[PDB]
Design a protein around this nucleic acid. Structure first.
Ligand code: ZN
Ligand code: ZN
Lengths: 647, 178, 616, 178
RNA sequence: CUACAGUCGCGAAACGUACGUCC
RNA sequence: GGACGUACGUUUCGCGACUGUAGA
């Protein structure tokens, strides 16, 4: 309700009428800076002329937070504040909201879709554009797709009343630069893509910035892995049996991939599984009955090796007991769905070593050494200060439940309460509010931006727990990349404003030349009629002459013969994206295939089985060759548009 | 040093020291290192920053001196051998001690949650009279200021226990002459 | 003198008159099978026709070994055995030796030099070319330069009496292939470059070869490096201090080699040294008196950082006491080579912490753990039985001399003879000390373990690919290699200056000579005949004199300055006089008109006035 | 096991333990692993594949049983406590022991390689009588066959030593009941 | 001077997995 | 369903540095 001295130095170049890349390290500081520019811009206009300041928000909780602030502030002055979201883009005309409002806080994804349709054909209707968190404008962003339409009007020759491109960020960033010469080239490339001339930073009011900065200290603690790994020895014997069982029907399995010697439980072995599994999907046996048996058996032998390799990464980071619960959960779901001769042999091979795996998991000397000292640093802070909140960042969602059950059932950590964010003493989140004075980075590699509240700092810690030298030396050079970022900003701030507007003017023309050179159109569509087969069973589903395109993104099937080829199943989390309503989920209607084919949605009145190309294989009926496409744009064929007049 | 000397200084043992400390050959100077060391896995490992002793006590003649200087936060007191190692010193059934908490208050525990003032004793000495259960923390020079008393049910070995902040490297405690 | 059945199985396709890829893993079996093919080829010749079988030997001890056995075997039959080495073919006609003898064992490098001069205009004079170690015929080899004239004669239309290109080897090799379909292309590319179709191997007499195979079992011993690096902290403090006093001479030092934040004691630091050393050599100041002091100071600062980082790699792999010996040898060498204000700063600071480095070196607490398990496996095999004479393979020549101070310099190990333990750097209990019946492999990182693990996978896919080619047809084998030889022939069949530049030193920046006086001797050596260059250098005797067929390395040359002593080149005796043949690597070329400087490492990358030598 | 029992089972100590052994909590089974163990560097470390015990000798009553099966090559014997640590068992001036060498010969040393035949004692049993110097190895069930005679000058601490082939994984010894 | 082999580093391009966001 | 971003890991191509070996 009352501005300060440091909240006026940042918005001082913004009130002059030029674009600024204001970087405030506070959470509510960026909200109060933007309100000062928004109030000053609307008051300087004479009668008849009105402002159309648009505040772009990247997320929906960021859109709903700024919608309450801008409505509880611009209400005594008589301004109209609205908001267009993904749930609000329908049932209203998009042209009539902009012409009858001033304080639109609509998301940038609707503006990119409208510029392709024809509604709001130019950005000359707006007078001010505010880009919240504008550091994401690097490549192909929805922030960048508006600037591609803005720079084409400035450097095109039809420039009208162009608006300001001010942006309130919190970290400008360097990228993948090694030296200051490349780090300087990233900031001028960001200033060229946002048409900037000024970069405001708090230099004269550093005393008030020190009160709210949230700067913790570094507490790197490198630990070692376990020596007596007996859980890995029993699992790796089952993986060698399954790899040998899959070689009885494919003698050239080692020739299908070009990866080196693989260790079980690593990331290099996971890439070898997908490369092998994609190589057995293009088999061309002319029997067409034994082909559906070898491709179904090799899909199950590669899926069990995928779950066996995934269970060893859980035992490497989390507890040994929770790794056994991941395999028993996978084998329970595969038993209830379907049973054949292939899956029953793999199920009974795991049950013969189940009692051996359950004995080494309940050993008090087989504790993970990463969890052995995580409990030690959690019981030393709570003995020192027992009223501290902490937070834990986990990389993989399969480990965020294993460390929740580790606390629930531990006598040394009986005071902690789970705060899983996949009356809460701990907070086990995956990826990020300025209330917890403890940060633990459990094997989680731009640092954590914990700048959300306008509170205090009070002293925080930044413990980094890892078991390899890659994560230790990565944070050591991240402090060097953050040190050279402030030096490259202060060097840019001591230049001349007349030459910096011409320095970025040659980057906007160079980047447009690359954008005008990468205009390669689509190739000739294959007029031959190919058919789509299943990925697990290789059964015939449909042809490429019954595929219709709804809105250049989604692909449905028109023919009625496909309607008896799937079975419905309800969605666990239905939602809507601007033209559809998720109601069911289609699967393969075979005996024991149960392959995920796509989804079932309602577009206007009908129900269309929208499928994906990641679960099919394209076989040409003329030659007989099979290919595996991963995206619908790479599949170049005759794309007939959908017509609701037929059915 | 000034009164009648009644006991001798204790010594640290390597059978109760945790895997994080590197006590030297004099057995009266614990220190924290950067990297923890792999030790044996038994029921005597505290998995904390606590150190116990093995000096067998007597009828009524007990006194020892321990310096807690050059320390951020410490805790020194009396504990029993028949206690779970996973528990925290000062939170068990009967272990009264004085802990310098993180909020800069010299608190004291007894089986309660009472706190002392804003003092900071550098060289704290513990007087023990187990014949009638008398405890007094005459630290230094303040006309024998105790300011706290604990009643112990002496029917068990009661070797003195210690605690220091183990997450700060370079911290060290030293036992000196009485 | 008793050829067995398995020795006669390999020679069966060789006697038919086709080029073969016979490979044998033993030493005695490989030399004996070549004698049977050589005896059968000469006995089957009719009257009036003589053979010209040549034996291309790669090395000189291989040439000397194959000369004594071939002379002692073909002596009763009345054959003319001889040998043409590099120290033999000087002022001898090559055409006279090949016309008067039949069992020539001439070096293939001499044949490449002879094929360009005009003598022996075609390869049709030979009848049986025997390539020893034929697996080296991959790219630009002297074996591969003879085949560039063989394939030109065969595919040139005038192919007449071509000889046989039977090539002996010990391993076919895989190379840089990862799958069976990629390892198959490497073997057919070798037979295409050798113009052969049959790969003779043992498939019926495997029971004879298993008796003598020399194949031990592997044993991986991976350990972790030291953590209490007390020697590293004193060295890196001296290197960080030396780098800080080097930034006062050149202001823009840190922006020259921008790769990453460098770490001490690794190979990445060594690449940072040579890059910043070359950057201080292209400086151009118009005073020409302070510039000579700036580049002389920055050269001594970068060289001392190079010698400090060189001794750091020895401390992580070898004993700590040999690291100080590498530093005391470098400092005592510059103590008698010159003394200015720059080296007096670095020598006095080194003698300050000399007692600090000597104190930590004698204590056994700060010891590298790679020598600990090496000491553990030596006293464990000899304890079982005293018949376990060892062979040690060492890569670095500085690292094998550091191990000599450990065999008799340590009181625990005494039953060894530095014989009883071999220190051969290049060839029952074999220890692979960082080199990539039982074997061992000591390392500090997981890279050497995974590099040897895929080598056993390469041996598995090599033997599988050999038997796949042995079931093909002979008509399609010569047809497949015909498409390869025509494809490589197309790729194989696919400007001077007139300025006047001057040559300057790299550390002294003094005017030595100009490019108008540099002459060309035999398209590889560049000397200066001018009289102004004769006073700019000083002589120095060679530690190891030798010759290469036209010269005499009598003495080395050095820069004639006060404390420079830069390695400029060498002094040779070509025909009747002496000429200072120099190298362009330790020099700086500067233009008179432009003034910019350029750094060249090889003479072929420096295009300039190449005037031939004149004896007048 | 059928005669009068004179002694008890020994126990391995952690002060003379080798850097490659991973003996468990029962302290009666030596086992070599793939990776060595990081221990302290002092004059008590053998830096070999040997181990010592904690049982001091007596007048005449010494007997224990040890299992030497599931092993490629082993060596069990008796050595003195005052012994240099860099030496291997069987080369000391007073160390009576038997070595199962790589040449499949059950050799023995008396400080003079006393080579014997090709006998293979599975579970060996060592008799010691320090009063009159009597040593005889009745291993298992072979009607108490001695097969070796040794005389010791027992006037020193005589803690028993062991040895195992450390270059082969899976090699392990176990002490059983007499 | 030529040539081979090994290690390390600087770039470009393609692919896979995981996480998160929006329509 | 689709689009985008970040992080790890892998397959190549091209260039450069250093060490070692061999020959003339
Ligand atoms: Zn299917
Ligand atoms: Zn010079």
């Amino acid at each position: 309700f009352k501005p300060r001295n440091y909240q006026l130095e940042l918005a001082l170049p913004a009130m002059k009428g030029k674009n600024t890349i204001i970087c405030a390290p506070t959470g509510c500081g960026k909200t109060f800076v933007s309100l000062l520019i928004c109030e000053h811009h609307l008051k300087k206009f004479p009668q008849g002329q009105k402002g159309k300041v648009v505040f772009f928000a990247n997320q929906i909780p960021v859109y709903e937070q700024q919608k309450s602030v801008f409505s509880k502030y611009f209400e005594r002055h008589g301004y109209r504040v609205t908001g267009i979201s993904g749930a609000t883009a329908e049932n209203v005309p998009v042209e009539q909201i902009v012409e009858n409002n001033d304080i639109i806080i609509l998301t940038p994804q609707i503006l990119v879709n409208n510029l392709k349709k024809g509604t709001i054909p130019s950005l000359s209707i707006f007078t001010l554009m505010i880009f919240d968190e504008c550091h994401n404008t690097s490549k192909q962003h929805p922030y960048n797709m508006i600037m591609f339409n803005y720079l084409d009007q400035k450097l095109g020759g039809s420039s009208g009343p162009l608006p300001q491109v001010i942006g309130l960020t919190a970290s400008v960033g360097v990228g993948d630069a090694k030296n200051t010469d490349e780090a300087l080239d990233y900031i001028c490339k960001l200033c060229a893509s946002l048409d900037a001339s000024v970069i405001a930073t708090v230099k004269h009011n550093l005393e008030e910035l020190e009160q709210v900065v949230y700067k913790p200290q570094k507490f790197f603690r490198k630990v070692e892995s376990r020596i007596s790994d007996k859980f890995k020895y029993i699992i790796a014997q089952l993986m060698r049996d399954t790899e040998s069982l899959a070689k009885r029907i494919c003698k050239d399995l080692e020739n299908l991939s070009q990866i080196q010697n693989r260790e079980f439980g690593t990331q290099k072995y996971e890439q070898w599984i997908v490369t092998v599994q994609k190589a057995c999907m293009v088999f061309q046996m002319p029997d067409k009955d034994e082909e559906s048996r070898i491709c179904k058996a090799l899909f199950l032998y590669t899926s069990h090796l995928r779950k066996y390799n995934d269970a060893l990464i859980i035992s490497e980071h989390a507890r040994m007991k929770d790794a056994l619960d991941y395999l028993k959960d996978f084998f329970s779901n595969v038993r209830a769905a379907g049973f054949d001769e292939i899956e029953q042999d793999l199920t009974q091979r795991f049950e013969e070593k189940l009692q051996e795996l359950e004995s080494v998991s309940r050993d008090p000397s087989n504790e993970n050494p990463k969890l052995e000292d995580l409990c030690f640093i959690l019981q030393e802070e709570y003995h020192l200060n027992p009223e501290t909140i902490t937070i834990l960042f986990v990389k993989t969602r399969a480990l965020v439940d294993a460390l929740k059950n580790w606390i629930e059932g531990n006598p040394k950590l009986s005071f902690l309460k789970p705060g899983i964010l996949t009356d809460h003493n701990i907070l086990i989140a995956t990826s990020v509010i300025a209330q917890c004075n403890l940060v633990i980075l459990y094997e989680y590699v731009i640092k954590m931006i914990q700048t959300r509240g306008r509170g205090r700092a009070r002293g925080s810690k930044c413990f980094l727990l890892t078991s390899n030298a890659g994560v230790i030396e990565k944070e050591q050079i991240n402090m060097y990349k953050e040190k050279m970022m402030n030096d490259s900003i202060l060097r840019l701030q001591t230049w001349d404003e007349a030459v910096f507007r011409e320095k970025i003017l040659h980057i906007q023309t160079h980047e447009k030349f690359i954008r005008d050179s990468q205009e390669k159109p689509k190739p000739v569509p294959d007029k031959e009629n190919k058919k789509l087969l299943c990925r697990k069973c290789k059964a015939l589903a449909c042809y490429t002459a019954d595929v219709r395109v709804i809105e250049e993104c989604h692909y449905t099937v028109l023919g009625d013969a496909f309607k008896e080829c799937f079975v419905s199943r309800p969605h666990p989390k239905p939602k809507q994206f601007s033209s559809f309503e998720k109601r069911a989920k289609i699967f393969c209607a075979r005996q024991n295939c149960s392959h995920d084919w796509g989804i079932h949605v309602k577009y206007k009145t009908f129900e269309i089985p929208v499928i994906k190309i990641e679960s099919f294989v394209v076989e040409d009926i003329a030659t007989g060759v099979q290919t595996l496409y991963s995206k619908w744009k790479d599949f170049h064929f005759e794309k007939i548009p959908f017509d609701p007049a037929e059915m | 040093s000034r009164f009648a000397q009644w006991a001798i200084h204790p010594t640290f043992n390597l059978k109760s020291l945790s895997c994080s400390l590197e006590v030297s050959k004099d057995s009266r100077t614990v220190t924290v290192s950067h990297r923890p060391q792999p030790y044996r896995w038994s029921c005597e490992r505290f998995s904390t920053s606590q150190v116990l002793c093995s000096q067998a006590l007597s009828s009524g003649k007990h006194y020892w001196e321990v310096d807690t200087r050059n320390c951020s936060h410490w805790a020194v007191g009396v504990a029993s051998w028949e206690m779970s190692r996973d528990q925290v010193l000062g939170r068990t059934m009967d272990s009264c001690c004085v802990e310098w908490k993180g909020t800069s208050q010299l608190s004291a525990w007894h089986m309660k949650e009472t706190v002392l003032g804003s003092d900071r004793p550098g060289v704290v000495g513990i007087w023990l009279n187990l014949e009638e259960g008398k405890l007094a923390f005459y630290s230094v020079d303040n006309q024998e200021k105790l300011l706290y008393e604990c009643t112990i049910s002496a029917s068990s070995p009661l070797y003195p226990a210690f605690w220091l902040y183990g997450l700060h490297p370079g911290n060290y405690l030293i036992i000196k002459q009485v």
